[PDB]
Design a protein around this ligand. Structure first.
Ligand SMILES: CCCCCCCCCCCCC/C=C/[C@H](O)[C@H](N)CO
Ligand SMILES: CCCCCCCCCCCCC/C=C/[C@H](O)[C@H](N)CO
Lengths: 243, 284, 96, 48, 243, 284, 48
């Protein structure tokens, strides 16, 4: 009655039989923008079925010497589905999310992942220059659906240590206990509406802390799939398409 | 009668806490089924095992203070944010107001993502040999868009609209209060995004992380005189954060700092968070 | 209070001709007539208004705006015009 | 941007070049925050 | 108080100063599908601002020897805007429309157009064969935004005479009286939802009955623009994109 | 208290009319401002000038019948829809049930777009020299998907599930009733669309206008015997539309007909709707 | 031509939402605009 769960959003549903729990980020639910906090004077669009559903990204194979991964939200969904078409025709944007990272392994495998959610996750450059200076490319800061591997996961590629990164909303995927992590995140920004193309709010991060080990003869290919879903999404400022 | 489906809370709870928590007396547990020592860290929650359920405790009426640890008493301590060098003989000096250049107050402010505060500046101006020479100074505040002064005796120093402070070197240091001047609803120290649209490059994009909601203007200073006096000056600007609210905590910096606006580090020399010891099986 | 924009601020007009926008009978359809940014406090047509000169004494404006077009042709001339505002995220629209 | 919807249609013996005077103001919810000096002004003397 | 009108739908508005009246097609307003007539068991999407607005097509120059024109609805809006993206991701479709044909001319011009709305307007072939047989191409039946000129406007290219075509909802653009025609059309189909790609419900038709005449010296270029707008549109059956 | 804007009839009126309208007496109008003769045809409406406001009329109590003009009394008249030719010596004959092949009843049905009716078939079977020979016939109804018979004495004539009618040639003609058998909610005679997805060609697309909601099956007929009798037959099928409802009227056909399923005409010979006369200025 | 400005509000042009506006119209008054002291004269005194 606690290890079994089902999450139906839109026309899609996720079952699980070996879950742990569900984490609300900072104790709050994603909701629509109230009238006392809105600053635009147009009426927003709210599709509410066509954009609030579970989108499944690609799978990441987890190996012995993986140094870890990061996506940007809502960067990964600007080109998939009707959420990718409403986020290009409209200047303004507001949503929550509901994340789910699946990774199964047998009773003879061991290891652990750290699935956390970092608001305003800024990538650092990797040079000893005091001004010129190195800055990350656009496919490194805004990677898309294929993510990006960390170079230095010990400092999260931002000069900030992983050992204190449990202050963010997070779960663990311990292969002897569970196989999935679920984090529900509200809209966290200093402005009520903001653009979905320039500004990615937060970044999902999956880093294997204890490495994958298995005895000989076991299944060598352990993939990590990620299924995300917008919640309470609304757009504004209709114009022509800009990607 | 019409289409039907057109018709179709939180967790935390704040408590006013004055002193630290007490301790109630305990006893011994000899029973099965009820276990407070077993946790599950995979659920994303911390352990809730109190010390009354691990050992046998006594009754302690605790009277310690939890007052100095709040975010108002932690940030209302003024520290250095900028040093303006003025050598007279172009005759003036400017300073783009950016407090991310000095490292004592930067690392305290990088614990959080969004902060909403008022400030209280103080300008301690001395000479290069110690100070105290009776000359008169002018400190303008130039908002973004206002014309910066282009000369020692230019017309932008008439100062009919924007604020300015006249004070001698031999007076007590000048001190003002500054409101929340951002167009957003919070100063954000980490902006994962780009300011403008367009094709962003791969080699060197110097605009990644630039948050224009934080750029607050330019601070100009001259010596109020006609003939160029010949004396080298330094001002020191001290900011005190007051009436401060903070959101979304984040981990504290562990790597040594590099640039003002960018959170760079070198990957060839990554300093470990814990200093080394001999082995794992001994404590000293 | 409505004051006149200088939409025709080219290097050719040089006078009171700068205030007015020419129209004529076009051979092709779909065509463009004029264009200007919406920025009280930027170099361009808004600089010759009471809005664009009081918003230079102040930083950080906020709120809606309005643009009124008056037609000064003859009585017998007819026509229709499309007046379009496009929010930022791209360059000036290339066709109707 | 101003676009021709249909055309400028005109009868004979009538001029085929007309003008438009464009005006501008602000609505009822217009505000302004921080007072500064304007950049429209220069001076290099005392105006003797 | 009758020649002046304004029509604000969505973020767009049309003014007119020389109108005639507004015609409701068959006395009814476009509405959503009631629960007693629905046959699908999924929840539909209703964007209601992003898809209900005035889309302006291209202009048609009207000459001395024009034999007339026809568009298919909703064919012309399957590739423009967010209505063109919701009609490709979704299998089902339902909407109304609100049409507006602008055509101005001076006091020295003369002529008349017939702006009618024909439900289930089937194009005929033009051969004397009794079976092979000629059939119209796909760009003739489903023309798109560029429309198609009639070959034989006297029989509406369907063996059916124009003189009785006033039984459809229609107006006239008489150049001495008005300059615009407005027809508001509900959803007319034998099924509650139907596909927006295979099946175009009705067809707008503008045919000059009395020809354009003008004395020498007048403006020779008289264009005809058409501005249409969906009303109460809803979609269903989410899938991948099919154009 | 939450977001507010989430919270946010017809014209015609039917009257039971029994007889034709009456006429009330009139007088003469000598006044300005009130004009019933001036109309505006550009508004898309018809003229509403009654004859009491044009001339001076009398009082006429009108007792004429408006009963035979309704759509039930107009379509409940059975006409020929198909002729099935059976020459015995393959032994049987089929007929795809499509009433768009004969032109007396087609043009009446092309006044409207959507029609919802029941039917009442009648099969008048004769020989080629007039009829009346005492042989026994079988008429099956084959729904779409059912196996059509492939022989004179095949096993599909066992007829354990679908309907069939046994009647001799010398009996009165057989007559049944047929319900609304379409999967949609109305038979549509004009379907502006394509049945399937895909790339549709430019030269000859034989699928444009095909409405599969109208294809109702196959009508098969044989002579119930073992040895092949040698006699040529014709059946004639008469459909009577009853319980009929009609929607969305359209103009009546004016060009001569060509194919069953497609509304083709020839453009080189377009027949005028009104037959010619000498000049416009004389009536005869 | 009537010498009046346009009175078209934005609720009658497009479809708007409900916005409780809390912006300040205090610093724009003529007291807060002119109560900022600026230079008006420079007096030169040479003694001897
Ligand atoms: C005569 C008085 C002159 C001094 C007045 C200074 C007023 C401007 C202070 C604005 C508030 C602090 C500036 C912003 C803080 C941080 O440096 C920025 N957010 C940098 O990210
Ligand atoms: C033994 C009885 C056999 C005869 C029974 C016939 C039943 C099938 C009749 C279905 C209803 C009429 C068929 C449809 C009408 C039109 O032909 C189609 N809509 C063609 O468009």
């Amino acid at each position: 009655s606690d290890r079994v769960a089902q999450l139906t959003v839109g026309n899609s549903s996720i079952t699980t039989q070996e879950a742990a729990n569900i984490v609300l980020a900072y104790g709050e639910w994603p909701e629509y923008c109230p009238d006392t906090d809105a600053t635009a004077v147009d009426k927003p669009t709210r599709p509410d079925v066509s954009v609030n559903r579970f989108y499944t990204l690609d799978s990441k194979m987890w190996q012995e010497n993986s140094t870890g991964w990061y996506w940007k939200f809502p960067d990964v969904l600007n080109k998939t589905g009707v959420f990718g078409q409403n986020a290009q025709f409209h200047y303004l944007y507001r949503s929550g999310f509901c994340l789910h990272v699946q990774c199964n392994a047998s009773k003879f495998h061991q290891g652990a992942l750290l699935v956390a959610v970092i608001p305003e996750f800024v990538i650092a450059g990797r040079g000893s220059n005091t001004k010129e200076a190195p800055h990350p490319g656009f496919t490194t800061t805004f990677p898309g659906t294929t993510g990006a591997t960390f170079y230095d996961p010990y400092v999260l590629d931002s000069g900030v240590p992983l050992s204190q990164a449990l202050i963010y909303p997070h779960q663990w995927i311990n292969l002897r206990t569970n196989n999935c992590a679920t984090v529900i995140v509200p809209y966290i920004n200093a402005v009520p509406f903001d653009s979905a193309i320039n500004h990615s709010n937060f970044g999902l991060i999956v880093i294997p802390v204890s490495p994958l080990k298995y005895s000989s003869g076991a299944t060598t290919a352990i993939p990590i799939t990620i299924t995300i879903a917008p919640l309470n999404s609304e757009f504004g400022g209709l114009r022509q398409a800009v990607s | 009668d019409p289409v039907e489906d057109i018709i179709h809370r939180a967790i935390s709870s704040a408590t006013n806490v004055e002193s630290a928590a007490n301790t109630t007396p305990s006893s011994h547990r000899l029973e099965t089924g009820r276990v407070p020592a077993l946790q599950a860290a995979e659920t994303g929650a911390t352990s809730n095992a109190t010390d009354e359920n691990m050992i046998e405790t006594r009754c302690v009426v605790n009277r310690n203070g939890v007052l100095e640890t709040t975010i108002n008493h932690f940030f209302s301590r003024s520290g250095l944010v900028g040093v303006v060098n003025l050598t007279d003989g172009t005759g003036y000096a400017t300073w783009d107001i950016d407090i991310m250049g000095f490292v004592q107050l930067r690392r305290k402010c990088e614990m959080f993502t969004y902060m909403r505060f008022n400030a209280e500046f103080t300008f301690v101006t001395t000479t290069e040999n110690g100070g105290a020479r009776p000359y008169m100074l002018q400190y303008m505040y130039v908002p973004p868009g206002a014309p910066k002064p282009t000369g020692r005796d230019a017309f932008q120093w008439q100062t009919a609209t924007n604020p300015s402070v006249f004070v001698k070197l031999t007076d007590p240091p000048a001190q003002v209060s500054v409101p929340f001047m951002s167009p957003a609803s919070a100063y954000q120290w980490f902006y994962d995004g780009y300011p403008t649209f367009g094709q962003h490059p791969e080699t060197s994009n110097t605009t990644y992380g630039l948050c224009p909601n934080n750029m607050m203007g330019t601070f100009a200073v001259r010596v109020v005189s006609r003939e160029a006096s010949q004396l080298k000056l330094q001002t020191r600007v001290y900011m005190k954060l007051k009436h401060v609210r903070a959101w979304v905590p984040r981990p504290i910096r562990s790597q040594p700092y590099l640039l003002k606006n960018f959170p760079n580090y070198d990957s060839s020399k990554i300093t470990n968070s814990a200093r080394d010891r001999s082995s794992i099986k001994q404590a000293n | 209070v409505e004051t006149i924009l200088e939409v025709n601020n080219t290097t050719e007009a040089t006078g009171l001709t700068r205030l007015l926008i020419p129209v004529s009978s076009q051979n092709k359809a779909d065509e463009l007539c004029a264009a200007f940014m919406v920025d009280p406090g930027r170099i361009g047509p808004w600089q010759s208004t009471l809005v664009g000169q009081i918003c230079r004494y102040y930083t950080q404006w906020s709120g809606s705006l309005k643009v009124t077009f008056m037609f000064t042709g003859s009585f017998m001339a007819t026509g229709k015009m499309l007046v379009a505002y496009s929010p930022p995220g791209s360059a000036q629209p290339a066709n109707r | 941007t101003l676009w021709y919807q249909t055309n400028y249609v005109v009868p004979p013996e009538t001029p085929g070049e007309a003008y438009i005077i464009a005006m501008g103001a602000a609505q009822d919810n217009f505000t302004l925050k921080i007072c500064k000096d304007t950049d429209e002004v220069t001076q290099q003397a005392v105006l003797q």
